[model samples]
Target: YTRVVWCAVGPEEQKKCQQWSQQSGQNVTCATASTTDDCIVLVLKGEADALNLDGGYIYTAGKCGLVPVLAENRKSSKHSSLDCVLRPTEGYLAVAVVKKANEGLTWNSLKDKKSCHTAVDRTAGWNIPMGLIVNQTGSCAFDEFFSQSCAPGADPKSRLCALCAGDDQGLDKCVPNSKEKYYGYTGAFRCLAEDVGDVAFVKNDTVWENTNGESTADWAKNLKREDFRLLCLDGTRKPVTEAQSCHLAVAPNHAVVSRSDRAAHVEQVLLHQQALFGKNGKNCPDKFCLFKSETKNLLFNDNTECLAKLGGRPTYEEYLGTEYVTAIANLKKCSLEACAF
Candidate 1:
């Protein structure tokens, strides 16, 4: 009989979650916080029941006793007509992108290079890329691997945040949120596009979405996909189209997580909620669409087709896969306090 409490990442997102709470007819409620980790803390302390999390955050919460519930399923041509509700979620490719013109640059030459990341504690942007770097060099100081970079959510005064430009008003620089000019996937790619950084760490789709006229953004509109290359672990390079062969790792999709005790309840309520407001839910358009959001994203991604159930009762580690789990655990050894506290 307890209502599921969803955590909101910011004040703006809190308002959106409030609207959803009203539209959700008391089946759900909201707990507000200032950052992703803050919301994770709410869930951990029992102030909130659940929140959808990036794979990186999932690793943090998973280690602290949270469990994965449902995964955010996105459009996939192969699964277009299949049952998205029951289908297993597919992971995306985490790739290193560099301009084709940078012929001499390869995976081996990444040291002392300027980089762009989609903030900190995300999947493709931070964890997968950095995890591999740490494993390769056997170094705990991964930050020093890159000479200078624009990694949002990093220390504002550090070289990691040096290249990030704040909003037009010149405020909120190096912030984890979109307020930072060089934040998120598109922003990171734009950093490479503008030559602000030597390399960009992002998912395969991001390179495709922003190049070859796929993006209408002023900076990306004229960019050609052919101009980009994917850095491989073999120290070779390939076109962005070859990401399947030349990529860092395949990262698990973002998923909703809750305390182990509250998982079933959260899962039950979310399944029912999606029936009412999911992509083609009964009341969608006429009433509300739970997945739709005007801002960058709210409770769920706009691209979420459904919250597909995970096969079997997989633990957070199982869901993220052993390879990824091991990598994260290895890298966090250098800074476990940040992930936990």
Candidate 2:
């Protein structure tokens, strides 16, 4: 089993932590304890494997193991002394501040065994560190090509994985919120996609309720009970998740694409992209999408390439949505135009 760990040292050992601070860059810092009777110890969990007793920091054996991220370490007297943080097991660069609740209990006590989102410091651009599959040493996939383009030698064992960058692409990466009618419908959408054709874009759609109930979802007073399949794949429009209200559903890569009510709006696509399963066999075909495959127990361990045909609804903007395709496109950008036979 693979385990990541992190250990903290006291302020007295400023020099040692400084080395780690320097190696880790501006994201982390090492400082001396401003107060007395203050002891600092590393918080262990996840990938933090080991820490040398006097090493001044909880760390693994290697010169470069996963860095131990401090959730919070502050100097306070009388009533401020609770700091417990959750270390991320599956990824790298954890960013969280340990807070002391009014009850005087450490924030860690209230944390669930599962991962939860916490409020971030906007001043420092409260953002979670992106997951990178550091070093990838596999023939089936390359770092930037298949997974995240990690730092040189960052792919320790070169695990066969991909860097799933969540919402880091800024506004341009997704369908711009500016244009609606042609691109946004402002409702709960059932589908979303990455448009790769002429208009290159990422679109999403949804349906809204209104009328009978206080919400727009009240079909009786809003519109009618219907199974609406929204789509986007056009040069003039971008892919979006709101056809109406934002119950948007973006289909996963290996999801199934079936016939749509509006043929011109969403063209049914088909192709083999390897059948994915999450403990349960035959995924996409079951839900028509792999969006439901995320869970702790059963995992999607396979990453075989397969063809996929999707009924694409063109997005109004030009942006590469898919990670794998986007990486390839960027690589191609640096090269001369496609080779002529």
Candidate 3:
């Protein structure tokens, strides 16, 4: 009998995982999970085998004894080195962006501004960036800095959701789930482009990708790179293309995680499946692509080119390294005891 590889994903990902299961022959079967937390619970209870996760959620999974099975080998634009993505000491940059017309706004003058974030727990959108704010203001009441904001997953009635215009009927206004229209990478960018936010905290590539005709969305389709600029630490603004020269903290790429006991099993199945469904896999012409970027699928990032081996199953502390861990810890301290700090 084939070992079932239960994949926790959203509805779109369910279709993709089922197709991948079909292609895996008798080696593995498939199952589905509706949300990230659900996937974690399922894995701990032996109901699901593995799932992909954003860096922010890695700590939560680690606390629950889940281990990383594979890390995404994201290509680096700085150096032409492949190893950067393997162990991944250097990571993606988090950036703050605003419209070029917002001339008076600078990094230092962002106080009382309206902000947009991908989510409350996202690395780029929250942890690193908010850590900087807390460090500067010496407070956890970020509501003071941003007059109003849309940080999904935060308390619904809080100032974080003050500016949020939720789904079609304006429901789930402050809800954390995807039901909130402006809740993800593209969604945060959408928030800014729609004038709902004065600034957006997201990955460096977010603005460029959405404005350069890369996004097919109605709001972003007409955006131009020249119309937006990145806010640097020194309170100066630069073109969106200049993120490499200026930006906020860098973040670890996403990774696939499995329960500690099933780590090896999950890795083996993933490696075998990647051989057929990966970027250069033999199954490309067969219409099954693992790295498709059309949507934020569950259990995997749509843009991941390939999953690199970790050499060993390192604990979250070991895999994420000291600096990253410290940053996350600092963020938590502010969130919990902002007044004490």
Candidate 4:
């Protein structure tokens, strides 16, 4: 019996007096006819005790006065052997056949355009492009998202494995200090500290230098780590003495303040999800299930070391001065004359 791909079967799919080597259970077996000549055999053998029919076809044939079996089934008990019409069920068989004919071809390729998987019908043919495919194809803007910052002293293609403020991953280079910037309190806090008098930036070393003359905790308490953890939303602020005061700076027009528990109910716990500049860190997947943006559905958050705080979720969004990915200039490449910006 033929099991129609996208439609119900008809008499041809039913069978009469047939035998099969029973695999285990259900001993009954039946044979189906290849042509209309076996229609009588199907009925006489009790194979097609009931020729399943569709209602739409019955209604249509009756409205045109071309069918009698439907009228009989509607009234009398002796409706057996009566003929009824049915509408052929529509199928996406053509679409499937066409797509099957063209595999591994680019969407913009000329051959793909002329096939059933062509531009117009591709979407309906279950031919959605995988999100990662776009990520791999550097030609698209989506690639910017898929490519993680390669780590310092590691393969340039290596992706970021750590989370940070804004769920962004700057190039996986060695950041000076990674902890001690937010809710986390690592013993060491190192990054290029601005020297006001020298008017230059100095990288951190293990010399125990006291540039700010303040303990790590004291520095965190006073410094504004907006780049690492902006207080745009309610929960972004770490546990503090008075969180409501921390929210005094958020613009009044923002809407994220109400939806998040971090924003609605302030926590006075220690700093969490802050940016700790580090040279190299492991790369991990940063998932952002909820975040809204003006131009796209892309999400961002402090994705360093996946978090359970911040509602135990990641929130990636635009921040004032945070740069997840940084760019480098190749010095061994093309001539400076031609590469000058």
Query: Who wins the TM-score comparison?
Result: 1
Q: Write the per-residue lDDT of candidate 1 for residues 46-153, one digit (tens) a residue.
A: 999999988998988987889999999988878666788987788888999999998899999999999999888888999888888888898889889999999988
Model 3: lDDT to the true structure: 0.76
Residues 226-259 of candidate 2 have per-residue lDDT tens digits of 3222222121111122332321122122111111
C-alpha lDDT values of all predictions: 0.86, 0.20, 0.76, 0.19
A best-first ranking of the candidates according to their lDDT comes to 1, 3, 2, 4
lDDT tens string, model 3, 105-224?
A: 998988988999988878888887888999898888776789999998788888988877777899768665565778777778889999999999988767766776777777888999
Better-scoring candidate (lDDT), 2 or 4: 2
Q: What TM-score, over all chains together, does every model reach?
A: 0.89, 0.15, 0.87, 0.14
For candidate 4, the TM-score is 0.14
Which residue pairs show collisions in model 1?
Answer: none
How many clashes show up per model? 0, 64, 0, 40
TM-score order, best first, reads 1, 3, 2, 4
* 127-239: candidate 4 lDDT, tens digit per residue: 12212223235343321332332111122232321211211244322221121121001111222121101000111111122223332434333432222211212323322
In candidate 3, stretches whose alpha carbon ends up further than 4 angstroms from where it belongs are: 1-9, 22-34, 77-90, 169-171, 295-299, 336-341
